[PDB]
Structure formats: C-alpha cells, structure tokens
Design a protein around this ligand. Structure first.
Ligand SMILES: [Zn+2]
Ligand SMILES: [Zn+2]
Ligand SMILES: [Zn+2]
Ligand SMILES: [Zn+2]
Lengths: 145, 146
DNA sequence: TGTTAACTAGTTAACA
DNA sequence: TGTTAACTAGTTAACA
C-alpha cells in the first residue's frame, strides 16, 4: 500500500471512530452522570475559567447556537449557573455547581489518559524518528487550512 | 504527555475540525455544478461502477440503511438516479444513474484522485526511509482506534 | 453577542 | 431488506 493510500485510510479510520462526537478520546467515559462528550468538555472548561457563550464556542470551535443549547441543557440539570459580569452587568457568565465538579474532573482525567497513550506510542521511536513524525504532522495539518 | 503526544492530540483535533458535517475527507473544492453532500456524490460514484441496492451501498459507506434511504431520496428528487421499482417487478430494488449524474459521478471520482495526489506530493518530501518511519507511525496510531 | 427557525445528515428500533 | 417514526447534536440566517 502506497504512503498516499495509507494516509487516506487513516483519516477515514478516525472519522468512523469519532462517530458523532466532536473530539477524539480513548476509552470509555467513566462518569455516572451521562452527558455528551461536548457537554462534559464544557464543564471541564468552566472549572478552569468562568466564561460566556462566545468564549466557550471558540474554545470548542463550534457555533454560538450549538453552545446556547448545550449550556441550556446543563442548566436544566443544575450542573451550571449563570450570573453577570462585574464590569458590564449585561454580560451573562456561566460557572459550575458543586455537583458538576467531579464530572469535569473526570473529563480532565480522560483527556490526560488519552495523552499518555500517545506519549507511549511516540516512545517506540528514536528521538530522530520522532522528529521525522513531528515534521510529518506539521506537513499534514497544513493541508487542512 | 510531552511535545509529541500533544502534537498528535492537536493533529486529531485539526482533523475533526476540518471534518465538520462531512463523513469523508477530501481536499480542495467540490467542482461539481450540483450542490450535493460528499455522501450523496459518493453514492453517484458507486452507482457508476455498479448498479446496486440500499444494503450494499450502506455496507460500503459504513452507514445505516436508513441514512442510505434518505440520501437516495434526495438524489432521486433531483432526478440524478432512478429505481427499478417503477418499471420492474423483480424482488431486488436496484438503483442506477441518470445521464445527468454521469459527470457529477466522474467529478467526485476525480476529487478523490486529486486528494490522493496531494497526499503523495506531501510524502514525496521524504526519503524512502523517512516514509517507512511515517508508515509505522500511521500503523501504530491506527491500532489505538480498533 | 446570543437565540430561535428551519434545516441537516446522521442514529436506533419496530415492522411490512 | 428497506421504510418510517422518533430522536440527536450539529449548522447558517437573520434579527432579537
Ligand atoms: Zn467523561
Ligand atoms: Zn473533552
Ligand atoms: Zn464533487
Ligand atoms: Zn467520496
């Protein structure tokens, strides 16, 4: 198989692996509270910094419309709460309820375990082989802008 | 978690972000005069190789027969394909292209060829050794998604 | 900025 | 096998 066909099939492999999620994780979500990957990710963000619809939408690279509806569902489930920015009283801020704290922490640990799998995948290669690969990734990502 | 893992993780991110609504990854613009999803065009492409059924098409696309039903219907309401059930009482329900779709089908096949070509050019920037290291990295990654 | 209308392109499962 | 009905989690347009 050509290097060209391999890249082709690899891309399609991760496509079906992702299904209808918007991010790649390895292993199963170990949170009893059941939420979309996107929702859990949002909770992860609010653990770091209180924020707005816009700020959330950009980190996730999805539409403010999609955020409006994810935030709303988390708000029905009392996982988040709104308040107003101090500088501009009209600005709507979102932050976590206590109940959401572990859900976010579980999502953070999930990302962290996905990264460990990669690091150890990267460790089957010499500092140089790794360098080659790093170049490859920079080359490939570039095609995608 | 070090530089390499993070670069990998981010790269997968860039793919998902490029993926969007499409269930396929193709580079460049879809130069087809008709506005169709890549899934719908890819169907047209398959039908050009071989008359077939909802199931065989669903198998090949790795999507559900219900998804196939809905896609076939849009293709059909745009008079790009036709079904045997309007003219034949055979048990098999076969889908075929209308002459209007022949070129669209051809364009989609070409789009795929060009995308392969772009990939090859990218890899051509590497020695045959360097392509073997890359090829082992790709195989190793593919493993994690089994 | 942020939210609904209308849509989208997929999913599962019950059933001629 | 292929259709449908119910659902799902995105999208853009336009204007609230
Ligand atoms: Zn989780
Ligand atoms: Zn996440
Ligand atoms: Zn096309
Ligand atoms: Zn295609």
């Amino acid at each position: 198989m050509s290097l060209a066909n391999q890249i082709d099939q690899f891309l399609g492999t991760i496509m079906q692996f992702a299904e209808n999620k918007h991010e790649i994780l390895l292993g199963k979500c170990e949170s009893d509270v059941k939420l979309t990957s996107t929702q859990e990710h949002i909770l992860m963000l609010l653990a770091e910094q209180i924020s707005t619809n816009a700020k959330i939408a950009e980190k996730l690279k999805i539409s403010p419309a999609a955020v409006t509806k994810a935030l709303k569902k988390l708000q029905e489930q009392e996982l988040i709460k709104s308040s107003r920015a101090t500088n501009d009283e009209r600005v709507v801020l979102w932050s976590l309820t206590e109940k959401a704290v572990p859900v976010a922490k579980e999502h953070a640990t999930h990302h962290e375990k996905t990264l460990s799998t990669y690091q150890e995948l990267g460790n089957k290669f010499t500092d140089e082989e790794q360098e080659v690969i790093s170049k490859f990734l920079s080359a490939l990502t570039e095609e995608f802008q």
